[PDB]
Amino acid sequence: HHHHHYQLKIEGQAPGTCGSDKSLLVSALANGIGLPYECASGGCGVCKFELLEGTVQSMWPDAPGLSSRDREKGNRHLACQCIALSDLRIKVAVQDKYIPAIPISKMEAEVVAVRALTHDLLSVKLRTDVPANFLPGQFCLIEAEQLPGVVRAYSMANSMNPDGFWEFYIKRVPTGRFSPWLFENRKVGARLFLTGPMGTSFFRPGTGRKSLCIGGGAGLSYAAAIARASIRETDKPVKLFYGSRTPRDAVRWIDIDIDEDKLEVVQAVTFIHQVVDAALLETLPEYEIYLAGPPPMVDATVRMLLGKGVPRDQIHFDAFF
Ligand SMILES: Cc1cc2nc3c(=O)[nH]c(=O)nc-3n(C[C@H](O)[C@H](O)[C@H](O)COP(=O)(O)OP(=O)(O)OC[C@H]3O[C@@H](n4cnc5c(N)ncnc54)[C@H](O)[C@@H]3O)c2cc1C
Ligand code: FES
Ligand SMILES: [Cl-]
Ligand SMILES: [Cl-]
Ligand SMILES: [Cl-]
Ligand SMILES: [Cl-]
Ligand code: NI
């Protein structure tokens, strides 16, 4: 239904516009403003900003993204958790690196293909009208009309293509809202809204370096997409690890669809981030490394890698908040 458009005055920057049913973050990114973000889901806190003038409705007040140091300030909010209720004056430190490489849009999608990788995991491929332009390792915020007020980040598994396909592996979380849906009450022909492409943890080409991919749990999508781009780039030895709790979170490679021969998997079946240190030892620093999965598994791998020589700028990751 209807949307209102308000003025988004952002200090030090050109007057943009925000919306009444769009996060402030996706409003700014639509304007091409490199407003800091990571999860876009209320966890990282990277999208924090102060309110100089105006009002906002928070999608989720309890959001642990902002430290109570920011919360004690009182006028600080998460850009990924706010909608504009009026004209707004905000102060955020913006950075070019966040500027979208490919212009983000909200688009209409139709479920075209479903595949059960495991009982825990399900691949859904959706068709948009427009081409599916996105960088390897990026994500979309995916909404569903029947479920109002629940947007959820999901990493692209497939690669950018002219015929407008978007594929996601989603893991079933009982106790969740969105996951017990595609896993229960949805099928081919179901209608979904895709907001993207989002993410700054995408594949970097032309570094002239080895490429290591480590994906935990549902972080297979991100890890696959990177690895399946790494071999397209050079076909030099490209490494991909997978993390699962039980050896029965079925591991398949034709189901995950690469050069089976030119990609050596080291699926770890429990914590992954120890075998990676085991096999590669001190080879790490010469790799560009890419990381995805639940926050505890991801937030732990970053220090084991950082403490073992690897420069900060050589590591890339999306934590599944
Ligand atoms: C960058 C990124 C990429 C991701 N990629 C993938 C992927 O490829 N595959 C995959 O399976 N999962 C991915 N996730 C996690 C994905 O959101 C899961 O589906 C998550 O478990 C949500 O499922 P749910 O809504 O059923 O669970 P819920 O338990 O309903 O929601 C859990 C998450 O939703 C958010 N949340 C909590 N409360 C609220 C609220 N009141 N309003 C709005 N949001 C709330 C929080 O981020 C929380 O961690 C990703 C997350 C991020 C941040
Ligand atoms: S980007 Fe808003 S908290 Fe992660
Ligand atoms: Cl201002
Ligand atoms: Cl949004
Ligand atoms: Cl907030
Ligand atoms: Cl948009
Ligand atoms: Ni109205």
Numbering used by the authors: -3 to 266, 279 to 329
The study reports:
Carbazole 1,9a-dioxygenase (CARDO), which consists of an oxygenase component and the electron-transport components ferredoxin (CARDO-F) and ferredoxin reductase (CARDO-R), is a Rieske nonheme iron oxygenase (RO). The electron-transport proteins of CARDO, which mediate electron transport from NAD(P)H to CARDO-O, comprise CARDO-F, which contains one Rieske-type [2Fe–2S] cluster, and CARDO-R, which contains one FAD and one plant-type [2Fe–2S] cluster. CARDO-RJ3 is a 329-residue monomeric enzyme that belongs to the FNR superfamily. It consists of three domains: an N-terminal ferredoxin (Fd) domain (residues 1–99), an FAD-binding domain (residues 100–196) and an NADH-binding domain (residues 197–329).
The type I crystals were resolved using SAD (Se atoms) and MAD (Fe atoms) experiments. The type I structure was refined at 2.6 Å resolution with a crystallo­graphic R factor of 0.249 (R free = 0.292). The type I structure contained three CARDO-RJ3 molecules per asymmetric unit; one residue (Leu289 in chain C) fell into the outlier region of the Ramachandran plot created using RAMPAGE. In both structures, electron density for one Ni2+ ion, which was deduced by analyses using the anomalous Fe-MAD map and CheckMyMetal, was observed on this axis and coordinated by two histidine residues of the N-terminal His tag from each of the three molecules. For further structural comparison we used the type I structure of CARDO-RJ3, as the FAD-bound form exhibits activity as an electron-carrier protein. The Fd domain contains a [2Fe–2S] cluster coordinated by four cysteine residues in the Cys-X 4-Cys-X 2-Cys-Xn -Cys motif. In CARDO-RJ3, Cys35, Cys40, Cys43 and Cys76 coordinate the Fe atoms of the [2Fe–2S] cluster, while the main-chain N atoms of residues 34, 36 and 38–41 form hydrogen bonds to the S atoms in the cluster. In the CARDO-RJ3 structure, the position of the main-chain O atom of Cys35 (Cys35 O) was closest to the methyl group at the C8 position (C8M) of FAD (average distance of 3.3 Å), suggesting that this orientation would be preferable for electron transfer between the two redox centres.
